[PDB]
Design a binder for this molecule. Structure first.
Ligand SMILES: CC(C)(COP(=O)(O)OP(=O)(O)OC[C@H]1O[C@@H](n2cnc3c(N)ncnc32)[C@H](O)[C@@H]1OP(=O)(O)O)[C@@H](O)C(=O)NCCC(=O)NCCS
Ligand SMILES: CC(C)(COP(=O)(O)OP(=O)(O)OC[C@H]1O[C@@H](n2cnc3c(N)ncnc32)[C@H](O)[C@@H]1OP(=O)(O)O)[C@@H](O)C(=O)NCCC(=O)NCCS
Ligand SMILES: CC(C)(COP(=O)(O)OP(=O)(O)OC[C@H]1O[C@@H](n2cnc3c(N)ncnc32)[C@H](O)[C@@H]1OP(=O)(O)O)[C@@H](O)C(=O)NCCC(=O)NCCS
Ligand SMILES: CC(C)(COP(=O)(O)OP(=O)(O)OC[C@H]1O[C@@H](n2cnc3c(N)ncnc32)[C@H](O)[C@@H]1OP(=O)(O)O)[C@@H](O)C(=O)NCCC(=O)NCCS
Ligand SMILES: CC(C)(COP(=O)(O)OP(=O)(O)OC[C@H]1O[C@@H](n2cnc3c(N)ncnc32)[C@H](O)[C@@H]1OP(=O)(O)O)[C@@H](O)C(=O)NCCC(=O)NCCS
Ligand SMILES: CC(C)(COP(=O)(O)OP(=O)(O)OC[C@H]1O[C@@H](n2cnc3c(N)ncnc32)[C@H](O)[C@@H]1OP(=O)(O)O)[C@@H](O)C(=O)NCCC(=O)NCCS
Ligand SMILES: CC(C)(COP(=O)(O)OP(=O)(O)OC[C@H]1O[C@@H](n2cnc3c(N)ncnc32)[C@H](O)[C@@H]1OP(=O)(O)O)[C@H](O)C(=O)NCCC(=O)NCCS
Ligand SMILES: CC(C)(COP(=O)(O)OP(=O)(O)OC[C@H]1O[C@@H](n2cnc3c(N)ncnc32)[C@H](O)[C@@H]1OP(=O)(O)O)[C@H](O)C(=O)NCCC(=O)NCCS
Ligand SMILES: CC(C)(COP(=O)(O)OP(=O)(O)OC[C@H]1O[C@@H](n2cnc3c(N)ncnc32)[C@H](O)[C@@H]1OP(=O)(O)O)[C@H](O)C(=O)NCCC(=O)NCCS
Ligand SMILES: Nc1ncnc2c1ncn2[C@@H]1O[C@H](COP(=O)(O)OP(=O)(O)OP(=O)(O)O)[C@@H](O)[C@H]1O
Ligand SMILES: Nc1ncnc2c1ncn2[C@@H]1O[C@H](COP(=O)(O)OP(=O)(O)OP(=O)(O)O)[C@@H](O)[C@H]1O
Ligand SMILES: Nc1ncnc2c1ncn2[C@@H]1O[C@H](COP(=O)(O)OP(=O)(O)OP(=O)(O)O)[C@@H](O)[C@H]1O
Ligand SMILES: [K+]
Ligand SMILES: [K+]
Ligand SMILES: [K+]
Ligand SMILES: [Mg+2]
Ligand SMILES: [Mg+2]
Ligand SMILES: [Mg+2]
Lengths: 489, 7, 489, 489, 7, 7, 7
């Protein structure tokens, strides 16, 4: 977007002042949309010396004469040319600027407009900037942030020592990563993305995407009327153990609820019987194990079961011991079908296996599993979309890095998912998602498409739960998937 | 509702 | 407004390009408000070489990539600097311009954006401009005019040989006279006035006003609870004759329905009895005349009846012969009360009388009566607000020049009324208005204020009629006045 | 329509059998529309030997196998070729025909289909046809008539000794006069006109019309917004006397309620004061008469009052004595304005006057007034549209012959009005209509157009009365006119 | 709704 | 309804 | 409602 502004000005010939005017008026219109008539409110506009603060002077100027009171507190040392131009207009139009922030000033205003820092913030905020932001956050006034709440790193969503908590953020052209990843997502409040006149070609040259309803609706596979179960694919799920008997069941129904034709589980006997007692539409093949866990002695049987399916999911509830590790790695080296690799299959995975596979794969780690897989800390990998991109590219796979915002990438295209709620922070949630992804692959979506649709729909289903989200369980999530699909259409 | 337009 | 744009640029320092960008985006937002989502429509944008056409290039450019198709037909020879700048941006963004208008081109578009001429039009439109406008008017496409429909003289509302008929007109800063007076009012369709960033001080320095609901609500007199009839004033209406027995009755109830305390009519016997048989709350004094018309022999009695009132209305249904003329002029020369002068009192008026009066007056002519009073043709006086201003100023009066748009002026302030409908194009309508004005004066409004409130409310009452407007009569209008007052509050 | 069938067959080449099949299936579809599902009902189909009975065989055949029972009673001696063809098909399909009508047969059926006689009936029905029709009318069964109820003369609406009373009549191509005029209108019940495949050109070559809502909506004059009262015309009504003081008032408001700009009454003093006491928006000029009736001494004053109007209505409540007759005839000979001539002006009219007038006229007689005017009996003139046409043509006027079905004709075009109810069978109704017609003429409609719109709207207003129609009065009718106009739009 | 029938 | 703003 | 058409 720095690129996008520069190109719009330098190559397309749009005057910087036109962009800045459009940014500021877009903030006004956005506030009106959220507050109603603006004329009763008093506005405190906090402006830095950069272009963000310039946008703020435009906001302030456009409120003059129309609202109850406007005051600008200018907090910088110097002004960019556009900020200087708009400061001059604000004063010429009769506007009041002070250069000292006094805590009691918050008392006399209803709305604070945060135009302190935008995407130009570098480094921790200390000093009187930090004091001011902390005062604004303790004030309980309505806070509207220009472009990004001040203090959020727009590239990562990290807080740079302290940041404004906004009720409404108005950003320009495209959402920034910092609105999408946490903590920045939380500090953004309600986000509006305003069109300020960039050419639509530049806006679409973006290589990272937010997963939207329209994108997902266009990817949902077709249901031709003259179909039969084979039309919609066949999934094998290799899952479960004497310790973890529920995981197979949640993964399997995950596949069936998204429209897959046939779902087959391979589960150690007698845990396999748990599945059909709950959902008799599942096929749950008993696997004879020595001690309740898959091992190399089950390799040949699992390969045979795989010949007649379109995709294999492996990992939920497998356990992790050496014999599982030997099984998982030899199976995946030999399997010539797409694989969806989750949970304990990730914990025991030899990544050299991924590189040698001809067939595609999707990996679905949470950050703990990701950390183990690349030998880094959770803090190193969490929300680290560049690391995910590198890993997907090096291993020729799709990586679905799960968290409140989920990252889906094949190394060329990266998508961010923002559906879902904290009801998914509960055991069993991931197992359902694995099934959904396998299912969509079996129906004909590419690994990347299947992943994109599944993460969105899994989160949206959670949001359809009718009672308090903390009481959501995976079994209810399953029930809600077809509603999410209906609503998506 | 009137910042931009008068009817 | 030429002044207003020049001053905003030259004194306040707003770049001409910023004004022009804001004008164009305001057209887009306005269309969206009226059409819904724009993305399905194909737009034909007709641009002249002036700043109006420049605004059109801004519209066109901002639709690129968002709607089904945009095409600009550039119809000028040369381009102003801002038009040239925005033409260049339109092309840089990928936009298509042709310089030849081909009749069949209308077939392939849904919306025509008329940015041919704005307030810069001088002289009759002939030539290929006229052919193009006539084709657009016969096309049945949706027409959106930028600033003013092309072909309307923005100072007068006259059509300059031919003009675009618009569904929607988006104008900037303030409405223009040409939107307000007919025929231009008819060609404007629905009018939106967009704020494009002029300082609110310049916008309010305007000396001519449209009469609005908010203005009228702020002028309505107060009704203190501890009041009595004298609190709300007393009106004498001198009216009627053997020929015209209904006029007194309509004028009198006009005063009572707007909240006046006491209304007294002086009417030639026995026509005076008509009034109380219909509305027994009126006082209708019998005046002994020789032949059924007021004359000098009734001068002294009418002066006596006037001593105990706040305002006198004279003229409705008086007749016009020499003896009425002698009466009317000698009465008005001697009366030291505000006068509202209507109808036959206007037809016989010696304007030298107005100049010698110490007390104020309101004159309420239709253009036929105005024409007679200044010895000009109806075409000379109709919608001629500068002539009305001159007359009000020279004669120290308020002039209410009645027509579908009514002009109210004291020579310093001029207001335009746009309430009402064709149900008021029927005998008796004017008589009610005269009573309303006298009534409001009696309640304490200045002649200008009383006139402003009355013309608005008289028109708004007409619009509240529940069946087809052509069936409205003055007697129904009376019934609707208190509803209009209620709705105004 | 005999012409229309013959031409469709002989010139256009449509097989007679195709017309007849389409006629019969149209009866079936029409019955289904009115009865719902037909399958529960038993149908008795009464067929003559003509093409009407042929249509009946088509109906009967198309019910076979779909309804509870069908029986045809064939009542003729011989069969036309098409009737013979369709009789043969009915029998080939398994249908039962008897040739004897037995009274008790009505007991076993729910619906009687009357296909005995259509437009081929000539002469009184006697004999066993009459007995059968009388039995059907006393049976209380649902009766559906093919083309026209048997026994109605399709050219006049007269009953030919006896006729079927139908709940539903399905006729072909166009309504027949006999459906439109009484008594036939009453015997028709609900009328549906079916398209059976005649070319639309032949159907539109018809020279007599039923006045429809769509016709009236297309004739209503426009209300341009920039209008004034003169835009909508000016009417003088010459009316009333010491005997009949109410007629002027009803005629005048008649003109005002349809949107006329100015209405002036000339009424003998002091009866003129009655008008403004009720409706002060009327101008009611006092006329000095010797004994309470217009006479030659008022000729010059009435001519003077006429110079400044668009149309004059004369006659309501004038009285009829020699002095009124001399006045009316000399006024109309000298008046060079359109005239609407009603009531007592018709009773005293010298028709030679109409022939010598250059200006147009509308005459609005009821059949009693028509009878006097052409020196015939009421029975000779009532519903006699050919006599009305001849009179309009010979006297160069529009004739509006009032009755439950009103006939409007200029001698070339004749229109029938079917709006209205028995609430209009009350004094004062006609006086309102006269005003409506004058009003529309003043607004710019031709005498024929003004007449067409007025008769429709006057009847429709009556039907909008909210309580029982017999309680309708002319004063309520007036109130309802603007509602009728609104609903028409 | 009027191809077949006029009311 | 989306010329200016994406949600 | 079914003389002419079956659904
Ligand atoms: C299943 C069993 C091993 C429990 O382990 P678990 O909680 O599922 O452990 P996981 O491998 O899934 O890793 C969880 C860790 O990954 C990381 N993690 C997972 N999701 C994360 C996210 N969105 N953000 C940050 N960290 C995350 C955390 O460090 C988390 O640790 P925490 O639970 O202490 O907060 C154990 O109870 C059992 O069933 N075995 C008995 C024999
Ligand atoms: O709670 P949680 O889900 O475990 O996540 P936390 O907020 O505690 O952060 C855990 C780590 O992830 C990191 N993380 C959180 N938000 C991040 C962001 N948007 N970008 C990169 N890393 C982020 C933190 O730096 C933190 O580092 P630490 O392990 O050294 O303490
Ligand atoms: C009352 C009587 C004089 C009728 O006269 P009137 O129509 O009221 O004449 P006015 O003085 O009011 O003037 C009307 C004229 O003024 C002008 N006029 C009024 N309002 C106008 C408007 N809004 N725009 C343009 N012209 C207008 C027109 O020229 C109009 O003429 P028009 O009626 O032919 O179109 C007459 O019928 C009467 O009652 N006297 C009988 C004795
Ligand atoms: O109909 P109407 O109400 O009489 O008004 P019209 O449109 O016919 O115009 C009457 C006259 O008023 C004038 N008038 C109409 N609109 C006008 C405008 N907005 N500004 C100045 N005069 C105007 C016309 O020039 C016309 O001139 P004319 O008498 O020489 O023909
Ligand atoms: C007004 C006064 C003359 C009454 O006369 P009226 O009823 O109006 O007489 P009209 O000239 O209007 O003619 C009525 C006749 O015309 C004929 N008539 C009117 N409308 C008719 C219709 N639609 N169908 C058939 N005949 C009709 C009838 O023969 C009717 O006679 P009827 O009332 O006995 O049935 C009388 O009461 C009066 O006021 N004068 C006192 C002095
Ligand atoms: O009752 P009404 O309104 O007077 O009308 P009626 O039905 O009594 O008929 C009156 C006359 O009009 C005639 N009339 C009624 N309907 C008619 C029709 N549709 N065509 C021609 N004349 C008709 C009748 O022949 C009757 O003749 P009569 O005076 O010799 O008795
Ligand atoms: C160029 C771009 C990358 C950043 O530039 P910017 O918008 O001027 O940057 P910001 O307004 O966020 O802030 C810039 C200034 O904030 C202050 N700032 C940055 N980090 C700080 C820190 N950690 N502590 C204190 N102050 C800091 C600095 O003063 C910085 O410049 P400086 O070090 O020379 O003093 C950005 O893309 C841009 O120019 N515009 C954003 C889009 C927009 O607003 N559209 C309208 C048209 S310009
Ligand atoms: C200066 C102002 C009075 C008129 O200037 P303008 O807007 O350029 O004028 P328009 O666009 O209406 O049209 C100007 C050109 O139209 C053409 N035109 C005018 N009358 C014409 C006629 N009768 N026949 C053919 N062409 C004609 C002419 O080419 C004229 O200039 P030209 O004679 O040198 O060729 C006006 O107030 C203005 O500049 N702006 C309006 C507000 C606005 O759009 N806001 C955005 C910021 S500029
Ligand atoms: C030609 C047309 C004028 C009349 O012909 P028609 O339809 O055969 O006539 P109808 O069915 O009404 O009746 C004809 C027969 O009824 C009987 N009838 C007529 N008057 C009678 C009387 N007063 N007493 C007893 N019987 C009588 C007669 O038998 C007559 O012929 P007949 O004297 O030789 O015995 C008519 O326009 C027509 O042919 N069709 C009407 C439209 C239609 O049905 N469309 C389908 C295509 S044909
Ligand atoms: N707060 C949240 N908001 C949105 N999505 C969430 C949230 N917490 C968890 N999720 C989602 O729920 C799923 C959790 O799966 P994960 O495998 O990471 O945890 P889990 O306990 O192991 O589930 P399972 O027991 O099935 O393995 C992921 O899709 C994750 O993105
Ligand atoms: N088409 C219209 N739209 C809005 N207002 C109208 C229209 N026609 C007339 N009026 C209003 O109706 C009133 C007409 O009064 P005016 O005195 O001009 O005519 P009038 O026939 O003389 O009425 P009166 O008979 O009472 O004198 C004025 O207020 C005028 O502004
Ligand atoms: N039964 C009816 N159905 C429909 N219209 C009717 C009916 N009876 C009367 N009318 C209509 O009412 C009006 C009667 O006017 P007419 O002049 O014939 O009678 P009237 O008693 O003389 O009325 P007035 O006393 O006003 O002269 C006509 O339009 C007529 O067509
Ligand atoms: K900010
Ligand atoms: K224009
Ligand atoms: K029949
Ligand atoms: Mg998991
Ligand atoms: Mg007047
Ligand atoms: Mg009559």
């Amino acid at each position: 977007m720095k690129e996008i502004d520069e190109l719009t000005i330098k190559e397309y010939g749009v005057d910087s002042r036109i962009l800045m005017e459009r940014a500021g008026i877009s903030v006004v219109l956005a506030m009106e949309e959220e507050l109603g008539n603006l004329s009763d409110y008093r506005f405190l506009v906090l402006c830095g010396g950069g272009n963000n603060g310039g946008d703020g002077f435009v906001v302030a100027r456009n409120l003059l004469g129309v609202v109850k009171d406007v005051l600008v507190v200018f907090l910088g040392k110097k002004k960019t040319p556009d900020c200087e131009y708009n400061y001059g207009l604000y004063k010429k139009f009769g506007g009041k600027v002070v250069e000292q922030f006094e805590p009691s000033i918050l008392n006399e205003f209803d709305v604070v407009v945060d135009a302190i820092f935008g995407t130009g913030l570098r480094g921790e905020i200390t000093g009187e900037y930090a004091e001011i932001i902390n005062l604004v956050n303790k004030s309980g006034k309505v806070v509207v942030s220009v472009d990004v709440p001040s203090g959020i790193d727009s590239n990562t969503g990290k807080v740079l020592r302290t940041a404004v908590k906004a009720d409404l953020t108005v950003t320009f052209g495209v959402p920034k990563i910092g609105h999408i990843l946490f903590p920045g997502r939380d500090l953004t409040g309600k986000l509006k993305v305003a069109n300020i006149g960039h050419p639509v070609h530049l806006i679409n040259s973006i290589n990272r995407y937010v997963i939207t309803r329209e994108m997902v609706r266009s990817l949902l596979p077709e249901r031709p009327r003259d179909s039969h179960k084979g039309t919609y694919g066949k999934v094998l799920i290799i899952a479960g153990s004497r310790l973890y008997s529920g995981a197979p069941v949640l993964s399997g129904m995950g596949s069936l609820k998204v429209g897959t034709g046939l779902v087959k589980l391979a589960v150690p006997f007698p845990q396999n019987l748990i599945a059909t007692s709950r959902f008799p539409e599942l096929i749950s093949v008993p696997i004879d194990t020595e001690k309740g866990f898959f091992s190399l002695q089950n390799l040949q049987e699992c390969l045979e079961l795989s010949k007649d399916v379109d995709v294999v999911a492996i990992g939920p509830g497998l356990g992790n011991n050496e014999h599982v590790r030997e099984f998982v790695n030899e199976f995946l080296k030999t399997l010539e079908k797409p694989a969806v690799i989750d949970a304990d299959a990730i914990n025991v995975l030899d990544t050299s296996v991924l590189k040698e596979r001809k067939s595609p794969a999707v990996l679905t780690p949470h950050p703990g599993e990701m950390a183990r897989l690349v030998k880094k800390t959770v803090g190193d990998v969490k929300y680290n979309y560049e690391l995910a991109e590198e890993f997907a590219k090096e291993n020729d796979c799709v990586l679905v890095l799960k968290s409140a915002t989920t990252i889906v990438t094949d190394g060329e295209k990266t998508l961010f998912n923002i559906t879902g709620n904290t009801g998914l922070s509960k055991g069993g949630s991931g197992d359902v998602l694995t099934g959904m992804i396998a299912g969509f692959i079996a129906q004909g979506l590419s690994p990347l498409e299947a992943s994109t649709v599944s993460v969105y729909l899994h989160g949206f289903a959670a949001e359809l739960f009718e009672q308090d989200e903390r009481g959501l369980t995976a079994s209810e999530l399953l029930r809600l998937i077809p509603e999410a699909i209906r609503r998506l259409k | 509702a009137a910042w931009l337009f008068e009817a």
